[PDB]
């Protein structure tokens with residue numbers, strides 16, 4: 134069936150994030166096209182990602198991630214405990230964005246994960262506005278006092294007020310009252326939403342749907358292409374600071390057919406096990422991946438063994454062979 138990653142020490146969320154990344158087929162195919170031919174076998178993160186992806190594609194056995202851990206140098210537990218899950222992701226996708234530059238596959242990472250945003254400060258009684266367009270690769274939703282994703286987005290674009298003890302330094306116009314907000318211009322083909330359960334681990338109930346309509350949070354909607362999001366992955370944690378375990382649910386083909394990825398054990402599971410059971414109320418979601426309905430089949434284009442350049446094949450084929458140890 135689908136194949137697992139080893140629990141080889143204390144990689145925490147790493148295995149779950151790799152598998153979500155693996156099953157973002159278009160990212161995978163792009164990764165395979167990177168030119169690692171001349172990359173140092175053990176310093177190179179790009180090479181490491183291709184190997185893991187290759188193995189996840191071909192291996193009958195649980196897949197090892199040691200060279201990967203080494204390649205970006207989070208060899209300890211503190212590494213993972215010092216960092217957020219989106220920061221791991223940036224380290225991996227940052228290195229692959231870079232390696233793809235000057236190649237056919239340049240810009241695939243932005244193409245898949247990059248959206249844009251406007252942040253503004255508007256003065257009540259003075260004609261003065263500060264607009265800042267930012268990119269984003271992922272979103273950090275508040276959950277405390279929020280029942281669902283919907284309420285979270287609502288809170289996200291909430292218009293804060295800057296008043297009295299907290300007025301805005303509007304510069305030439307002196308301290309002024311204003312309202313600062315955020316708003317979405319694009320939403321990317323792949324939406325990575327992290328749920329801010331840390332503060333610890335808040336176990337409060339937080340609901341999320343299979344289908345997520347986001348048109349109503351954009352500025353301009355497109356009747357051609359609506360912002361409807363198909364739930365792809367659920368990154369899950371359970372436990373506390375003494376003992377905790379990380380796991381991920383995927384329906385890799387976006388067709389409602391879920392599997393549970395528990396390191397080296399991958400198993401069929403129910404929609405209920407993947408979704409409602411991870412609302413919390415202790416084992417609950419901390420990151421969810423959505424894909425835009427309209428890009429579903431592009432992102433999740435099917436992948437063959439022929440999509441992997443021979444040059445790369447041999448290199449790994451060979452590498453394995455040398456394993457030969459008494």
Ligand SMILES: Cn1ccc2c(=O)n(CC3(O)CCN(C(=O)[C@@H]4CCN(Cc5ncc(-c6ccncc6)s5)C[C@H]4c4ccccc4)CC3)cnc21
Pocket residue numbers: 145146213214216217218219273327328329330331332333334370373374375377418419
């Ligand atoms: C920007 N922002 C704000 C909040 C927030 C946020 O929650 N997320 C999500 C997140 O990134 C996912 C990945 N994370 C983890 O897996 C956490 C790792 C640390 N855990 C505590 C310790 N347990 C043993 C510790 C320990 C200490 C000393 N020696 C040995 C062991 S320290 C809790 C784990 C955790 C799991 C699930 C949910 C929340 C938190 C971090 C959070 C993302 N961005 C956010």
